């Protein structure tokens, strides 16, 4: 006969380029959005302008 | 600056050619406040002048004189009321700035003044 190498997800090296979680509310949810705020530095010059 | 004396000439020539073609200097000079302040670069400067309320509430970057006052070419600054003979007190008196345009064709000028006065209405 044969068995059947069994694998897991987490065990991979792969998951560390994503974050896992369950919803098990997502079957319900229209879009959703997620926002950001950036701020950029800035440098001070001088003379006329 | 290089070569003024030159550009002051060319200055009188583009004014006199203003007068003749009858597009006159006073529709292409505004006048703005005093100046206190400015930064230079090389040949580029960003003066600073008041346009309302009185000359001393601003404040110069000088340390010497913060305050300013008004400077007049005193060559060019006629007074009226004395001039007119009012018989007047002096007060508080007026300040107009006036030109004088004269039109003969190829022989033009203009003359410039400051004029002070109680007169409202100059006419």
Do not use: W
């Not at chain 1, 959005?33 to 530095?41: G, L, Y």
């Not at chain 2, 010497?64 to 600054?77: D, E, K, M, Y």
Request: charge should be positive; glycine fraction near 6%; include cysteine.
């Amino acid at each position: 006969c044969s068995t059947l190498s069994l694998v897991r997800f987490l065990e991979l090296g792969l998951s560390v380029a994503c974050v896992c979680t369950k919803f098990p509310e997502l079957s319900y949810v229209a879009e959703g959005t997620i926002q950001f705020e950036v701020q950029q530095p800035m440098i001070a010059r001088d003379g006329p302008h | 600056d290089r070569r003024t004396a030159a550009r002051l000439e060319r200055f009188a020539t583009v004014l006199r050619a203003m007068i003749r073609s009858h597009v006159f200097p006073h529709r292409a000079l505004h006048v703005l406040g005093g100046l206190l302040g400015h930064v230079t670069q090389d040949r580029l400067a960003s003066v600073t002048c008041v346009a309302r309320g009185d000359q001393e509430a601003a404040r110069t970057n000088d340390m010497a004189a913060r305050r300013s006052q008004v400077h007049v070419p005193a060559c060019a600054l006629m007074d009226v009321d004395r001039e007119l003979r009012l018989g007047g007190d002096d007060g508080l008196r007026f300040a107009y700035l006036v030109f004088v345009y004269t039109q003969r064709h190829r022989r033009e000028a203009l003359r410039v003044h400051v004029a002070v006065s109680r007169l409202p209405e100059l006419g």
